[PDB]
């Protein structure tokens, strides 16, 4: 419901260190308090019921969007600053503090993850969280262990309700 | 002997300079699969945060060591395959048989490049296997605790293991093609039926799973000699299907053996009950085949020392006694290492077993499906345990109303792993449920795949050279690897069709060829019938099993030898530099899972060939990515004078992973651009890359202007608009009356320039 | 050629019968390290509850595969060592040097037992290495995804890898002993000084870490030729130290090289600042050596391709230039693969570096120690991260008051891995604190250890045969393995002293010999000078490094040959059965951590030699334990007539882990009992076992009566009361007027009976 | 004291599944409700306090003791039924339902662990909990992940107090 922490089950574990299961209030606060956030979206955002949610989230705080994979065509019409980048390339670049970024103004401190696959974003975060200091907030419906903070295991309707609650609290 | 290069029979030290030169630009990126190391009893050691274990090895070193272990495991499985096959071939045919493979001045480009040896007889490959074995042992000795510490020297050893793996694959293919009468550089290889619907249940069915065709060759010999070809059906899973199909196909005639599918089909066909006997040999064989054949009364016969499956060893017993014991249910199978007796036992066992196990399968009926669907309570464990992240609870809930379309959709995406069934407290055979829901699609699952053609001949390469230099062929796309696809077996087909429509050169191999051949257009034609099968623009050719991947990379080597007159003998660094700087070829392993795929990718990287792998390959723990924003990374030497030269950032990776097949298409199109291109080749490459980016990502690329040195480097149909875009957004000065670029490109055009990464190659 | 056995040059299939016969009694017990498999990209797969992964392999199969990978890794590190050493020896001394080992009819028992060959020259060891490599490659091919599925053929392949490991060790040891002038079966090998307190800081100190001695021989040749022996100290860590101390020591003259310690000493020595240059070869070398040497200005020179350490390769540069660069701080070390230039660079580097770095160490001063101790908060992370489970917070809290005795106690138990320091938020160098607290013990840390004697000669075995038969030698106890001890390096010393006082035969090797030689009695004498170094009762002999462990096993083989006239050539099953049924010999690896120890233990098991491992070895994921309560497990055949014979449950295991050295002593005493013992041998073994059980467990064993078949099978001192205990508690009928057992034993006594585990050896 | 669940930290994890952190009341109930319990005791019980606590626990509920390692001399004079057995052997025997046991009356269903090393008992329990159905209760200082139920991470005084409070509820 609002819980988003009632289910943090996993099939396999990376280790003893896991991301913290957070609520919608904490997620909204962390997103709206970050100094320089980046909205890293995947192909899963192409759902006609998540793409507008993501667009509203990006518009609320003017967060630049990195549309990894083939999710770029969903951001051409919307008046947002979305750029294409390979997710593996982005994960490699994030660990370098000398990377100018998607706009040339430097690196980022926190990233927001939505619409990815549980085995690809986890692999990228396995490098990001181990060889850098960039924090990650996962607002997906799967419990991402390799993030810094992440939502629980939610259904589609529950995930969309939680995203709406985060939007209203932004 | 002739000219020998600086690096014959390389070791870890002998290739360190080239490896470090490559890693300077394409830095390794480590994506660890775990936070702990477990090699010795000092552990398990936690290494989170790049911490070091009790031996001082840190997280990066552990990830590099794990990838190196994967690479050496793959190299050891093509080398062992090669040694076994070559020993059997020499024992049967003699070791003084000339190596015949087609029409090519260089018969074994990989062997001549690595060892500097020109083998002319089957007995001349024996020392090369000894070297490939011996060095291999040393590499395995580095997996110990207390061995190499830095991760960079683990990456170097991984590249050495990759090139050794390519050498082993080359030896394997050379021996089998020379001996077993495979097609030899044949651009008209016969078409082969593929799919689940090809096999006929009205006849006894033999299913061969493995990689080597030593024993199934005897099986086919017995079937032909006794005239049982029309009275039985023989099918193959995995690469042994390709190898059995190519057998005795020098006559360009259609074979009678059929190809069932990839590894993902194995359990599925076992659940179908169609097989009447299963014979297993080696790599890529499920380890629970007997656990199901016991229920379905399907005998499982092992034929290798590598895979014995804990079965009784009846090698010295009578065939009739074994047949009686299997018929009466005493044992579910046996190890039959004697090829002569196996080749008779298997068809006889199928003939004597078919009438006793008709109509038995694990597929549920209508009422059983209704009960099984109504049993579920939507607890979500199966979705959690699914490797491909499939919405199984939603599919079952939709099927509760009688809407079995969701499971029919899920059937293509599933890979037959049965991992969900082990976490279902209701004990629902989910895989069987999906198979029954997709029975209608399974029935019409047929297709055509071209047989393995062997290695590319010299004449085809020479003919394609002009098309490459006159901007007629944009580049070379190799599609290899396994079948661990993230979104079903159609993405590879879509990529191949997209690149074939644009007159690329598509070379396929392994399970990817099987899954490409399974889809047809409106006219009911596969890609192999829609496009020719020779080395040409707009043509798709099949090399065969993954041991034929050594041809693909090998072909690139010949490009260096034929056109630049470069010496191949022990000249890995020079040929690799040439290929990296001049040849526009890229490989794609959309479903790579096994260590063989990792070894093949690493060997391709060491030869200067970039590779794009599926998202699951992010679990390999290593990629090779370049820093495009670092302008000091992209600098080379000029061979004419030793001066410093600038090159465009292409290729931007040596090995990377994409997420969707559209992103894969864009990346493959982009990374075929090379610094040593004339105007026409660069223009056609830019045209295709920009069009694909516009089609699939919806935007014009943000760095296209980097690959623009000349007004003739732009697409023909969109030249003036791109010139306006260059002028109004970047400040380039353009001669609008002459449609010529006056100034603005960082890198000028000089076709006579010779970029190189080795300073010892300059004046 | 003479008579050849049924199994020459074995493969996986050739030794399956013997391995399955062994596993019928001593079943494998799997103790998995994880619940997940992380091999291919289909995973990581969860296997908890013996569930199967996406490939069908279950938890037991995964544990067996992991142990098999450990075994093949160890076999590959002795084989690579052997090949490199043999190639260097052949290149230097020529390939036609006769093998010089000592005085024995069988020179290479392992090679003759496995391959069937009878080498006579150093060039005749070349084929054996080719075989050992070739089969090895095949074995590595089984680590791939999709290979063997059952968990029993993995165990069989592990035993094959073990015997191949023993063959490789034998080859390496024979080559080095023949060439480099090692002692040849000398029962009076020179005594060498050991300990951190032996090296003198006044002179420049060189420290050699690794296993290979090819470069160290050049270094000491240069030192002797230029007369720097008295002006410079040379020391070795790990087995390379034993190799130096055996070099040119057949003259029975004391050497100048000194053994510093085991692997657990390495970092500590680096933290001491005594070394002025560290030269590393390959196996067992900490990966964080440069990371500390850069702080303490200690240069690091690599001399092998296996371990380059990510260092610049200055093999082709001048020695003076490298010395200048290292002196000026440009680089912290270099790879110097040229032995001739390395042997000059290392001593010259030490000479030019000692004055500039004297007085620099990581050991804190008194005020620094006070501050560091007062900084701690007792958060408990260091105790959690300690592999040996050491009470570090309590020790630090006791040190806060001024009681530095707790850290002094902890120094012996600590293995110097610094894993604690990486989880301390206060950044306290705990290892340095413990070292400073134990400075006095470190200063007074000296001892004597006998040099490697080589292999046991035939005459000593023949002399000891009568002692074994007449019940004067209870059995053979081998103390080998690594130094990952659970309670410090004194447990091996205690076990060795306990078994030497009881007139056992103790043979030591590896780091265990070093740690045994580090302790003295009140008279200030070590065990090596307290007991003789021959092969007889009450003697402790040292074979040398781990490559000499083969000699131990080889000795057992000769017992089957020179006493029963058995044929050794290619007769693994027969000799192993003889050893298992007749020879009382147990091995002990109290601190085994490395894959070499696992391979050695598996090879010993396949030869019929049981071994007891330390508690940490429970992380190896496999043991071999028998079901004592199952009376049908203990049944063999009678070689005289093929009848069914009963044997007492001994040995009750092939591999098991003990927890404390007292339990280890009891187990070692118990498992030296064999079914073929005569009255006197059984009596002495029972006496020692019962006495040790009473001493350490405090009770009389509950199953002793299972080994009493004759009135003369009881201890002499406690015969009548044991007879009373048999009569009253069990109902046995005893002739009290003749002190004879009338009836009651299940197994009768028949010294002429010939137990066997092979049906084909009967009648 | 009463709280034995507030600390379940680990250095390395075997996998997703972990033992439950229980309290003294639950531990006493589980010990007192077992049909056939076995007290598996390592050599760490040789600490005098742990020695008499274990003796009292065994006396209270008539539980046979398996003194693994070299802990047998601590039970020779105490009036209990303690027998020596190798821990690696005992763990092998527990997975066989046809093993007569330490007295010949059959196998056991519940084992109690006190006074071991966390790297050895964990390795034995890795086999026991994966290839059998025997439940385990760890009343030791360390949090044993491979058990079925276990105490948390406690100090010496805290462990003594917890064992006392268990003994009073036995
Ligand atoms: S190899 Fe090193 S990191 Fe791995 S378990 Fe052993 S000591 Fe720890
Ligand atoms: S695991 Fe079984 S019960 Fe649970 S949701 Fe899946 S099919 Fe339904
Ligand atoms: S069998 Fe198919 S549906 Fe089930 S978990 Fe495996 S991939 Fe998913
Ligand atoms: S690397 Fe593999 S075996 Fe080791 S802890 Fe991770 S999942 Fe377990
Ligand atoms: S090898 Fe088998 S168990 Fe291991 S990850 Fe691959 S599919 Fe899973
Ligand atoms: S980790 Fe550091 S602060 Fe914590 S208890 Fe250990 S020494 Fe003290
Ligand atoms: S350095 Fe010593 S005290 Fe520290 S964790 Fe390692 S063994 Fe324990």
Author numbering:
A (entry chain D), D (entry chain C): 1 to 170
B (entry chain B), C (entry chain A): 39 to 801
What do the study's own words say?
Carbon monoxide dehydrogenase (CODH) and acetyl-CoA synthase (ACS) play major roles in the global carbon cycle through the consumption of CO and CO2 gases, production of acetate, and breakdown of acetate for methane generation. By contrast, methanogenic archaea employ four copies of CODH (α2ε2 heterotetramers) and eight copies of ACS (β monomers) that interact stably with eight copies of CFeSP (γδ heterodimers) to form a massive 2.2 MDa complex called the acetyl-CoA decarbonylase/synthase (ACDS) complex. ACDS plays a central role in that process, wherein the A-cluster of ACS cleaves acetyl-CoA into CO and a methyl moiety, the C-cluster of CODH oxidizes CO to CO2, and the corrinoid of CFeSP receives the methyl moiety, which is reduced to methane in downstream methanogenic metabolism. Through plunge freezing of the ACDS complex, we captured multiple subcomplexes including a CODH tetramer, a CODH/ACS pentamer, and a CODH/ACS hexamer and characterized these subcomplexes via cryogenic electron microscopy (cryo-EM).
With the next-generation chameleon instrument, different dissociation behavior led to formation of (α2ε2)β and (α2ε2)β2 CODH/ACS subcomplexes in addition to the α2ε2 CODH subcomplexes, allowing us to capture methanogenic CODH/ACS subcomplexes. Additionally, from the chameleon-plunged specimen, structures of the MetCODH/ACS pentamer and hexamer were determined, each at a global resolution of 3.2 Å. The structures reported here reveal that both A2 and A3 of ACS contact CODH. On CODH, the interaction surface is formed largely by Rossmann fold 2. Interestingly, the C-terminal extension of MetCODH, which differs from the C terminus of non-methanogenic CODHs, interacts with ACS. In the structure of MetCODH/ACS, we observe density consistent with CO binding to the proximal nickel of the A-cluster. The environment surrounding the CO-bound A-cluster of MetCODH/ACS is remarkably similar to that of MoorCODH/ACS. Substituting for Ile146, Val149, and Phe229 of the A1 domain of MoorACS are Leu504, Val507, and Phe601 of Rossmann fold 2 in MetCODH, respectively. Upon performing cavity calculations on the MetCODH/ACS complex, we see that this enzyme uses channel 2, like CaCODH/ACS, but MetCODH/ACS uses the channel 2B branch. In our structure of MetCODH/ACS, the channel between the C-cluster and A-cluster is open and resembles the open channel near the A-cluster in MoorCODH/ACS.
